[PDB]
Design a protein around this ligand. Structure first.
Ligand SMILES: Cc1nc(N)nc(N)c1-c1ccc(Cl)c(Cl)c1
Ligand SMILES: CN(C)CCCCSC(=N)N
Length: 288
């Protein structure tokens, strides 16, 4: 039983089934349209340049939505958007997207193929720390080894009136229930750990930082998960379990258990002839 984190194989294909089967994207887009404006309201006050740091930037969809809200709030102001991302593949697509968008003149990008850790250490070696007006870590803390040091570090880079935004699954989502109850019966991949908003808020309370946490409901249609032999439903099985071919490798005593739970009022809600795994997201805003 190997971790789906296999890398650029079943991972990607399973991920895709996750996107085209959940409101993951719409959920974040809804937050950027209704809450982001208020949040970035003063990050550029008194400045002739706005510095934005994207950790785990990814492909850039949401990144681009963020810039747009920042731009309408600060017409004419140059923006400097740096991106910290380890995967060349992700960087390639991010670049492609930029070259197709046309409202990006006052915006200059720079991409760095490295991890947030390499960034952290490599920046602790130079001179004094460069400050940022806005930093964001969207769905990537799962891949960080030392979360506390990471949160203390990046918070120390926040300039005057600056804000840091972080997004992970909610402590009240199905994932939370899925990991607590079956977390150890799933392949241990030291490349990623389980993290919910509960864990994050406790680490933030302990670090003594001031934050605000908003939850927003999202779902993942796992209807194909109850249709024996459904090849797509099997795909979702791999993403959830973080295991390749979960259906054909997992103890008959394991899956048999999951079936009953992936339907309970804690894991998923049922309606319209559908089963919707709870994908609630958390948006934490950390003040400088
Ligand atoms: C929920 C989730 N959501 C997103 N947007 N990306 C992910 N990579 C995960 C995920 C899936 C399985 C495990 Cl084991 C862990 Cl740590 C994280
Ligand atoms: C979707 N998934 C393959 C990989 C994401 C890694 C961003 S890692 C970082 N900045 N330490």
């Amino acid at each position: 039983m190997r971790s789906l984190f296999s890398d650029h194989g079943k991972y990607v294909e399973s991920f895709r089934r996750f996107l085209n089967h959940s409101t993951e994207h719409q959920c974040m887009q809804e937050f950027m349209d209704k809450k982001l404006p208020g949040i970035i309201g003063r990050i550029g006050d008194t400045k002739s340049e706005i510095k934005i740091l994207s950790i785990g930037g990814g492909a850039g969809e949401i990144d681009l939505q963020i810039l747009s809200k920042v731009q309408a709030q600060y017409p004419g102001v140059c923006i400097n958007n740096e991106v910290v991302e380890p995967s060349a593949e992700q960087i390639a697509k991010y670049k492609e997207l930029v070259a197709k968008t046309s409202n990006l003149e006052n915006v200059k990008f720079a991409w760095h193929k490295e991890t947030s850790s390499e960034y952290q250490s490599r920046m602790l070696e130079k001179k004094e720390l460069q400050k940022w007006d806005f930093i964001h870590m969207i769905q990537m803390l799962y891949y960080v080894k030392d979360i506390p040091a990471t949160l203390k570090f990046f918070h120390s880079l926040l300039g005057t009136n600056a804000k840091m935004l972080i997004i992970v699954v909610s402590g009240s989502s199905g994932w939370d229930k899925l990991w607590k109850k079956y977390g150890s019966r799933f392949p241990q991949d030291d490349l990623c750990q389980y993290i919910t908003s509960d864990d994050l808020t406790q680490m933030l309370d302990n670090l003594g930082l001031k934050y605000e946490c908003y939850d927003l409901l999202s779902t993942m249609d796992i209807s194909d998960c109850f249709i024996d032999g459904n090849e797509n439903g099997d795909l979702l099985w791999d993403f959830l379990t973080e295991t390749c071919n979960f259906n054909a490798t997992a103890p008959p005593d394991l899956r048999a258990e999951l079936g009953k739970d992936l339907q309970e009022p804690e894991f998923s809600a049922k309606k319209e002839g559908k089963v919707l795994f709870n994908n609630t997201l958390s948006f934490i805003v950390i003040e400088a």
